[PDB]
Amino acid sequence: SREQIIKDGGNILVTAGAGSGKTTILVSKIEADLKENKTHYSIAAVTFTNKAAKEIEGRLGYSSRGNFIGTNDGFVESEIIRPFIKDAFGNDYPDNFTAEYFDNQFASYDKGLQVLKYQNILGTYSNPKKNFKFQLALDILKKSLVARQYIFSKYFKIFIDEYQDSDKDMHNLFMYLKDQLKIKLFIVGDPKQSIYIWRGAEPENFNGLIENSTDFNKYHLTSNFRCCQDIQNYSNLFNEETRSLIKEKNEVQNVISIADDMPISDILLKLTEEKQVLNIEAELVILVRRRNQAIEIMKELNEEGFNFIFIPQTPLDRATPNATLLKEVIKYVKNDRYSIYDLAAEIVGNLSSREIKEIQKIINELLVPNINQVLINQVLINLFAKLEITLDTREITAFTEVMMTNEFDIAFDTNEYLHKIFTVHSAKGLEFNQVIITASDYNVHYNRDTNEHYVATTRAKDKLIVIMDNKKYSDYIETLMKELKIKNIIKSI
């Protein structure tokens, strides 16, 4: 498992999925290797977005080892291109160059050298599949002897995040550091095609390393690593592929089942005061299928003194290529404390201060109120035109609808609330500490809602409370408990 992962000191290839399993293990693996190694060598972690680089830097702590934590583009720029470009190509080339991602697309590698030599800027390649900065960095290393000496002397291992999005030119540099410079590589990626890719992503180079590489040591990560063992056993029994991984335990305490005989508010009081299996001071969230089921529970609790705020699923809450970025644009529009730098951190690459000012100009048109649906669509196209990303028609309408109304404001609110209620689709992504669900929502016999039920069960982190509303739900438990000869998988009050 994870203990076997961190012990390996060689080239490690990690398959990460379900989210957050990659980030926590990455930070723990980095800080553990820093404690083992006392020599002068440092580590280098590279992330596509600037937020992930800042997220890793905050958890690691002091970087007195000289460790580099930053963007993929910022790494090759500050460590390879800028220091040794004059050594590789002569004194004609500048080291005070400014890289602009959006401007100055060129057709050939020879053309881009002239933009850097004469126009004093570092422009991107026109083809999204070919990266000019990494082609330049790899070229500089082969031309410059000092460049190869410095990289070997500075870093002994390099950590790479989200490797499935790396392009071929970006992939060539990483393999060049491992094959020629003999630098250890810790690779984290998602083998599934998924929904999120960098504009020049090719999953085959990552998939090819899993199939034909003898140097790397392959590992895998559990999807529900953060969930406790008792919650994992209750979640995995509903899907046939997941039933094999769980192991039975002599005593089960985290998953509680209680039949709904008293009103909904009384069940909440019973679990909080009579058995104290749920703490009122800990965050508590309740699961529903539809928005109406959440409203009636929220209104029933306001009468009993319980205070709650309910997050609804927005039109943007849909598996689309630009869903993650579109939500961040909404968070910058809705919230005043959300800085433009926080929005730029979500954008791939380390944008310059001048490029940030141009993107800020496009979005400032959305900060004026009551300017109708047509202008919101053009600002959105103008925004994504600079990023060279086309926008889905339903993604545009979903973005527009959220901008018009204040209905989905708290779903993108920066503030955090202790007690909430969310829909199964509302928080498909984020995870909660303790969750209560009801059985009548999910049809378990024909597996229509088993995927929504599996998501519902995996959201809870410490304690999961299940209400046995449906007899067919309880029958599917008792039937499969006999197939697997499981005496206890649930704790009933």
């Binding site: 002068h40 060598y41 220091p83 000092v146 000496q149 410095y150 002397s153 500075k154």
Partner: protein, 138 residues
């Protein structure tokens, strides 16, 4: 086969112009007790932060002449980079101050010019692969 090649001391106290080859282990001796002590202080001024912050006084200049500039250069050999771990220590910090044409050598220099009004000459540390265009140590 030694990282420390030679050290040059110009116009520093009793050192008019002195060139001394070096190695990893060095032993200095002789009748001139003043020269041995100034030799160690000349190395501290180049490498010891605590002794370097105090700067140069009028007495530290050779023959108490403030017109002549004090110059202390340490020549280093980086040829054994492939098998010397301490050599890679220096490379990791020097970064781009080296050139590939003269990758085997690296210079560490101390230059000092005296100001009459300020009554104080500061210590400027430069390094680089070429002795002609040394750059200020960041």
């Amino acid at each position: 086969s030694s990282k420390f090649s030679n050290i040059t001391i110009k116009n520093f106290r009793n050192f008019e112009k002195v060139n001394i080859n070096l190695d990893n282990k060095n032993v200095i001796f002789g009748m001139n007790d003043i020269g041995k002590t100034n030799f160690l202080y000349a190395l501290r001024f180049l490498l010891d932060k605590e002794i370097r912050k105090f700067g140069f006084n009028k007495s530290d200049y050779h023959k108490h002449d403030t017109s002549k500039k004090i110059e202390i250069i340490l020549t280093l050999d980086l040829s054994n980079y492939e098998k010397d771990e301490d050599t890679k220590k220096l490379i990791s910090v020097v970064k781009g101050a080296r050139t590939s044409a003269n990758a085997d050598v690296f210079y560490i220099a101390l230059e000092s010019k005296y100001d009459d009004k300020e009554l104080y000459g500061n210590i400027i540390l430069k390094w680089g692969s070429e002795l002609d265009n040394l750059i200020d140590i960041p």
